[PDB]
Design brief:
- Belongs to the beta/gamma-crystallin family.
- There is one protein chain.
- By secondary structure, the protein is mostly beta strands.
- The protein has one domain: Gamma-B Crystallin, domain 1, CATH 2.60.20.10.
- It is about 5% helix and about 45% strand.
- The protein has one helix at about 25-30; strands spanning about 5-10, 10-20, 20-25, 40, 50-55, 60-65, 80-85.
- The chain is globular and about 25 Å long.
């Protein structure tokens, strides 16, 4: 299992899956995830996803613990860095 980030609302468009870890903007890009692009994501039960508005896990932080068809108006297309936990 893994966290899957999607380009469009309700899990539409391009997608990219990631294992637990702390990913910076550069690392997201390498994994084929553009900046200000994430709109929805699926999260395994028991996992936690901290999406940060700025690089290096700073700026506003939005947390998700279950499938999310829409991250929210403020959080939409703002993920620049992200921490993923299997806890
Ligand atoms: Ca988008
Ligand atoms: Ca941003």
């Amino acid at each position: 299992k893994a966290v899957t980030f999607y380009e469009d609302i309700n899990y539409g468009g391009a997608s990219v899956s990631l294992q637990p870890g702390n990913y910076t903007l550069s690392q997201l890009n390498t994994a084929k995830i553009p900046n200000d692009w994430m709109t929805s994501l699926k999260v395994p039960s028991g996992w936690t996803v901290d999406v940060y508005e700025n690089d290096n896990f700073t700026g506003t932080k939005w947390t998700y613990t279950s499938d999310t068809p829409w991250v929210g108006n403020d959080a939409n297309d703002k993920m620049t860095s992200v921490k993923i936990y299997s806890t």
